[PDB]
Amino acid sequence: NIILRVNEDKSFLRIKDVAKVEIGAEQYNSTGRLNTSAAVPIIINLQSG
């Protein structure tokens, strides 16, 4: 419902008209598996000393 423009016919141009909005992810490429089963890998690094 963010108003991009007003059409002078007292009608509003909104983002829904020109775009498709959804809650997705920042990046979709990387993945992780645990025995052929999707999982989120957490790499833990040991602090020095």
Added chain:
Amino acid sequence: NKMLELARTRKELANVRTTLDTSFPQYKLIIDRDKMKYYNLNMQDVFNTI
């Protein structure tokens, strides 16, 4: 508040208090975005004026 009442009524504790106070008066600003853009107004300009 419920937890504080439970701690007050039993469990061998003398003083139980919370510093969470939600009684402060506030003015909630409701922006009519349709009316705000019906006049050619930017939101940031409005809040800079405020």
Added chain:
Amino acid sequence: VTANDVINAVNDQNAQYATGKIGEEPVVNKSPQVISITMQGRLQTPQEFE
């Protein structure tokens, strides 16, 4: 022409970088490969600043 017109033209036409990736998830699905698009606005030689 004023010196401001030169400041603005140099500041605008000598520009940093902008990149993207074409053929990347999720818009393109099961693409054969991923290609990166790079655009540069930088000027390096005095003839390019003239």
